[PDB]
Amino acid sequence: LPAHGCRHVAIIMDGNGRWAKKQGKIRAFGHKAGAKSVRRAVSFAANNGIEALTLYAFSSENWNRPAQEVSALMELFVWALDSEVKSLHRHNVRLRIIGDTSRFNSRLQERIRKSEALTAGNTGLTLNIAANYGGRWDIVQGVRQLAEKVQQGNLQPDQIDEEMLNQHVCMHELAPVDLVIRTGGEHRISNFLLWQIAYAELYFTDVLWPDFDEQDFEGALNAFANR
Amino acid sequence: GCRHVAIIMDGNGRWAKKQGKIRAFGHKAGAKSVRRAVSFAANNGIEALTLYAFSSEPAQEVSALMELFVWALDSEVKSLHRHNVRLRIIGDTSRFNSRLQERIRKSEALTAGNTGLTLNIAANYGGRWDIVQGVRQLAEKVQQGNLQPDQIDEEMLNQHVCMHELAPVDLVIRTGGEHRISNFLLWQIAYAELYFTDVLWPDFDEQDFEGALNAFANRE
Ligand SMILES: CC(C)=CCC/C(C)=C/CC/C(C)=C/COP(=O)(O)OP(=O)(O)O
Ligand SMILES: CC(C)=CCC/C(C)=C/CC/C(C)=C/COP(=O)(O)OP(=O)(O)O
Numbered sequence A: 001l002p003a004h005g006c007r008h009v010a011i012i013m014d015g016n017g018r019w020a021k022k023q024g025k026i027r028a029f030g031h032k033a034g035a036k037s038v039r040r041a042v043s044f045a046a047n048n049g050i051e052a053l054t055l056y057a058f059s060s061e062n063w064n065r066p067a068q069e070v071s072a073l074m075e076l077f078v079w080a081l082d083s084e085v086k087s088l089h090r091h092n093v094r095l096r097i098i099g100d101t102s103r104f105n106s107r108l109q110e111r112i113r114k115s116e117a118l119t120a121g122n123t124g125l126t127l128n129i130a131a132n133y134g135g136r137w138d139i140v141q142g143v144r145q146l147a148e149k150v151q152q153g154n155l156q157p158d159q160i161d162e163e164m165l166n167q168h169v170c171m172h173e174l175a176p177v178d179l180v181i182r183t184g185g186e187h188r189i190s191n192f193l194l195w196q197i198a199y200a201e202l203y204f205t206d207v208l209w210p211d212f213d214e215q216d217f218e219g220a221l222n223a224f225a226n227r
Numbered sequence B: 001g002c003r004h005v006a007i008i009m010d011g012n013g014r015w016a017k018k019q020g021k022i023r024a025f026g027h028k029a030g031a032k033s034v035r036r037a038v039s040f041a042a043n044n045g046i047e048a049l050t051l052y053a054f055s056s057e058p059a060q061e062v063s064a065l066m067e068l069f070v071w072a073l074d075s076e077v078k079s080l081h082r083h084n085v086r087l088r089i090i091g092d093t094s095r096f097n098s099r100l101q102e103r104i105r106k107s108e109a110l111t112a113g114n115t116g117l118t119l120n121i122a123a124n125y126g127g128r129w130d131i132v133q134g135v136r137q138l139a140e141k142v143q144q145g146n147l148q149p150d151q152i153d154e155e156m157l158n159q160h161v162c163m164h165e166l167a168p169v170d171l172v173i174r175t176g177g178e179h180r181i182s183n184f185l186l187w188q189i190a191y192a193e194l195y196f197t198d199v200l201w202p203d204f205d206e207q208d209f210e211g212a213l214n215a216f217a218n219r220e
Helices: A016-022 A026-047 A067-083 A085-090 A106-119 A135-152 A162-166 A214-225 B010-018 B023-043 B063-082 B098-112 B129-145 B154-158 B207-218
Strands: A008-012 A053-057 A093-099 A126-133 A179-184 A199-203 B004-009 B048-055 B087-092 B118-126 B171-175 B194-195
Touching: A008 B023, A016 A026, A026 A053, A026 A214, A053 A067, A067 A106, A067 A126, A085 A093, A085 A106, A085 A126, A093 A106, A135 A162, A135 B129, A135 B154, A135 B207, A162 A179, A162 B129, A179 A214, A199 A214, A199 B194, B004 B023, B023 B048, B023 B063, B023 B207, B063 B098, B087 B098, B118 B129, B129 B154, B194 B207
Parallel strands: A008 A053, A008 A179, A053 A126, A093 A126, A179 A199, B004 B048, B004 B171, B048 B118, B087 B118, B171 B194
Antiparallel strands: none
């Protein structure tokens, strides 16, 4: 019920590399600065009445990039889980990872499993980290779930409707996505959420993610409130 | 090289109000704009042009609309044909009366062989509805026991969504000022460039359309 009236924001956090290069700095510095930015956005959202914040962390397509780039991201994901989870919990933040977790090594899966569990009963902001995630993959998984009900004999094809598949895509349990923000200048979804953004406001800014701060977040919320 | 362009044509009503006229007037103007956009796409080598006509979303005024569609086909198909355009309608048409469905089939039949622009007219279309249709197909095969839930993957499902036979959509344009897809193509826009403009549809012209291709040409 906050004034901007936005309940679920989703973010494509692009620009980190470009941010570091403008400065003559290597890829890694932009990742350092991007993580600060994630801490800043998460905190902003918990403080401004947002119900859910969904961040595009690692796409299923990203696996096809230089090892130094994959492992760095993985490295940072492992670092966040091992060291930022206690703070999410102390903020009554509920953490969910969305995407094909089966591909991660069983040890990364165990950290994911424990982090979600620790925080599953939290009632504040729901933080969804999309890791090894894709909008098409997401739809495909809800499809197989349905197929399955058709296989066990409980579902009839002709009964499958929009509402039913809407109940089996990731985050079906949260308020619908009201606002998609993409930093970094590019104007495309890039196989981020697709089913879920049917009615979302799409908001593109050239600000590089490491520079995207609380004032830019208000900006985007205000542009949304004026829709 | 932009091969497939998709347009959400919003703004006819606001353009009418803005000109001080009734909604029907904006629509005549909007129609004139469709013609102008189709030509521009054709004279510019675009291979596919998909237009969002009406969403699934007085049982009388629907009728007047089914008759308009008929009117439009009857008056404009000869021209699309001379201009070597292949016409295709996407959307849930089972819902249309018998006469309009047959008129749609003869028009597609008449232009299937054309080798220029493929013009897709989305009538009673929904992005979610599209995926659902593919899903139902897939579900049927599973029921007959010829497909395990585990064998369904993106590629398989993609073969069951509208326009899977054509070049992927590269650019989605929405005139009118709103910044949303509005349940227009969903599955198909995963990688498309998204272009929003405040120009109302009736006013959208050749230069606006080029501006959009320019915005596409400049994507990284
Ligand atoms: C666990 C977790 C999700 C932590 C948050 C830290 C964070 C925002 C990392 C950046 C990830 C990313 C997309 C890097 C690639 O550079 P780039 O594609 O962003 O930038 P570029 O277009 O300029 O090369
Ligand atoms: C995969 C994964 C776990 C991703 C999330 C990573 C991340 C950086 C989350 C931010 C948590 C947050 C807002 C902490 C606040 O700092 P604080 O608790 O130090 O206390 P403060 O509000 O007073 O600064």
